[PDB]
Each structure stands twice: as C-alpha cells, then as structure tokens.
Design a protein around this ligand. Structure first.
Ligand SMILES: Nc1ncnc2c1ncn2[C@@H]1O[C@H](COP(=O)(O)OP(N)(=O)O)[C@@H](O)[C@H]1O
Length: 386
C-alpha cells in the first residue's frame, strides 16, 4: 500500500513520500535529505551512503560509486573505457560481457554487477523511508535519465527488485521534476518546459511538452561529464598551483591522498560560495606536514569556472534547435541538481531566457524524488496531490 519515490542519482540519491497531497522528502540517520550513492567494503563491514562516502579517501580501492555510469552497460562500451580512469576501484568484464566491480570485503575478493551496487543504495533509501514511517515499504517509483536505453532501464528495475522493492514504474528524471511542480495540472494549454539538471557528475537539459496531463520529451542534450565535481576540480587545480607558489614548488598532486583531502575542502568552500562572497579552504598537514590555507572569493570561483558555466547554455541552445523552437516559447525553466544553487549559473540561465525567473522553489537536489513520490502515490490509487 505504501509507495515511495526514489531518485537513484549518479552521486546522490533521495527518497520522498506523497501522502494526503503533500510531499515529504525523508532525511537519513545523519539528518541528510540526500544520501551519497556510495557503497564501501571494509575488513569488518559494508557501509552505504554517508558512512561510505566519509571513508572514501581512507579506503579508495573498496569504495564504489558511479555504478549508474555502468548499470545496464556492456563492459566493452567506449563510455566504460573512458570513465574507468576516474575510478580508484577495479572494474573488469565478465564472461557475459557485463561489468564486474572487484573489491576486498572481510579479507576476501568479491565481485558485483552494477545493479547489485545500485540495489544496495536502493535498499538504504528503502530503509530511510521505513525508519521514518515506522512500517515496511514495498512499492516504489524509480527515476532514470531520459536518455537511458532499455538495458539501462531494465537493470535499474532489477536493482529495485534485488533491494526488495516492487517497482511500480521507471519514469524519466526530467518528467519527474516537471510533475513535482504540478506543471501537468496547472494550465490545460500546451506548455514547453525546459529542465536544466546540473548534478555532481552530469549535466542534462530536456525540453518537454505538456498537453492535457501528458508529458513528451521532445529533445535532450547535455554533457555526461560536466557537474559539480568539475567545479571542485577547478578549485583543486588552483590550490595545487597556489601551494607550489607558497612552498618552493612542492607538488601536492604527487600524493593522491593529499588531493582527495584537498578536493573534500574545495567542495565545502564551493557550497559556501553559493550564499557567501568568500570562503576559506583549509587542510592541516596537507602535504609534507605543511598546513594549507587560502581564501577564495565568489568572483575568483566564477573566474576559474567561467567557461564551464557559460558552456551550460550550449545544450540549452541545442535542445531548442532540435525541437524547432525559440527560447521565448519556453513557459517554465526548472532548476534541478545540486549545482543549480550556484548564483552565476542561475544568472546565466535567467539572462539567456531574457529575465524569466526559473522554477527553483523545490530544493533542486530533491525535485526528482519529489516528482517520483507524486507518481508513486498516483499509481497506488491516491489522487490527493491533484
Ligand atoms: N549549495 C551548493 N552550491 C553549489 N553546489 C552544490 C550545493 N549543494 C550541492 N551542490 C553540488 O551538487 C552536486 C550534487 O548534486 P545532486 O543533484 O545531489 O547529485 P546527482 N548528480 O547525483 O543527482 C555536488 O557536486 C554538490 O557539490
């Protein structure tokens, strides 16, 4: 009877429930409204979510993330070959051509298919909802990117089944974000909706049309390797160079643990810069026992990321061209993904759309789970959100 909506994200996942027409995004054990899509294996335990992400730099080989980039893919795909440079964990091809993620767990070599790793994240999101409701949850709607093919969708459904969920439906992420804002209900006329989704690792722009409660994905574009992690890397590259100029050419980049610790602090400073004009990046005993400290203004962060930020408009122009429409014909621009909190990005989109205010009332990293939760309630017989 109880049905949840789950955004199974590349970097972060989110769970929501829609009851009585109202949507509650459920916080985890640490009070976090989103949970890292991370699974780690140690000498004693299997960690999922925050606990797994928090020990990633101390256990890189056995901390799995990015399974969404592998789910439903053949190991031989050029996407896998290219992405694997970014992973400290080992991925090999099985005899069936499916990827096998190799880790050490309790002193033993273990292998997992991408959907087994995703099933563990889904099981954690199921448990987050169960703790909140105080009751078992069996039904769920899971979202996937619009471009996911049949193999990727089926593998995501299989991940749900393995996690103990009865997957009522797999729906598109941009469509879920649009449903969250009630854009299917408010206004009977045809509506052209642009979903601008900039997360931790990917950038997806989708142009939808809504006529009479029916959403159709007219055009999609983006960049599978542009997200918040790339803005963190801009700060890391700067700090590495700044450390060199301060400490007689010493190179932090030679130590991968020093880089990971610096990256952690660069992402924290980046988030602060979304609501403050300045932030401090500080790592005590970063490299060679030398403490590192630097102050980054929002202006300097904007300068380091200038091309990357402006280039987010290129896939916006591409979807409008593919759909044969002018930017003036877009009725609503919905900001999705944690990176859409960056003021410069919001200003760039607003200027592009000639001063139109984007829909950002829903926490952008929760809008997809919010829409999935609405759809889960509808598919369960609850018409209260309408
Ligand atoms: N306040 C903020 N300012 C800038 N970036 C922020 C932010 N809050 C979250 N983010 C970024 O959002 C990204 C994750 O977005 P999210 O939408 O949860 O991840 P995803 N692609 O798995 O679905 C991370 O790179 C994180 O640094």
């Amino acid at each position: 009877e109880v049905a949840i909506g789950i955004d199974l994200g590349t970097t972060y996942s989110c769970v929501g429930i829609c009851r009585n027409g109202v949507v509650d995004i459920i916080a985890n054990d640490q009070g976090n409204r989103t949970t890292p899509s991370y699974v780690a294996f140690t000498d004693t335990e299997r960690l999922i979510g925050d606990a797994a992400k928090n020990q990633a730099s101390r256990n890189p080989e056995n901390t799995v993330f990015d399974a969404k980039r592998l789910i439903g893919r053949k190991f031989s795909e050029t996407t896998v070959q290219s992405d694997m440079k970014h992973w400290p964990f080992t991925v090999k091809g099985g005899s069936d051509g499916k990827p096998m993620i190799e880790v050490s767990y309790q002193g033993e070599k273990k292998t997992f298919h991408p959907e087994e790793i995703s099933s563990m994240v889904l099981k954690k999101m199921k448990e987050v909802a169960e703790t909140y409701l105080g009751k078992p949850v069996k039904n769920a709607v899971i979202t996937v990117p619009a471009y996911f093919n049949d193999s990727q969708r089926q593998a995501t459904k299989d991940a749900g089944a393995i996690a103990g969920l009865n997957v009522l439906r797999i729906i598109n992420e941009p469509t879920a974000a649009a449903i969250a804002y009630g854009l299917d209900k408010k206004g009977k006329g045809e509506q052209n909706i642009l979903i601008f989704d900039l997360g931790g690792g990917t950038f997806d722009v989708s142009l939808l049309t809504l006529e009479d409660g029916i959403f159709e994905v007219k055009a999609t574009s983006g960049d599978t390797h542009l997200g918040g992690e790339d803005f963190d890397n801009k700060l890391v590259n700067f700090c590495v160079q700044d450390f060199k100029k301060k400490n007689g050419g010493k190179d932090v980049s030679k130590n991968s643990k020093s880089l990971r610790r610096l990256r952690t602090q660069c992402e924290k400073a980046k988030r602060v810069l979304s609501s403050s004009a300045q932030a401090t990046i500080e790592v005590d005993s970063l490299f060679d026992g030398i403490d590192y400290n630097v102050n980054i203004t929002r202006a300097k962060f904007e300068e380091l990321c200038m091309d990357q930020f402006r280039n987010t408009l290129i896939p916006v122009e591409k979807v409008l061209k593919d759909a044969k429409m002018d930017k003036s014909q877009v009725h609503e621009i919905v900001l999705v993904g944690g990176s859409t909190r960056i003021p410069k990005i919001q200003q760039l989109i607003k200027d592009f759309f000639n001063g139109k205010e984007p829909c950002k009332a829903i926490n952008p990293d929760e809008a997809v789970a919010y829409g999935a939760a609405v759809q889960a309630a509808i598919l369960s017989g609850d018409q209260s959100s309408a």
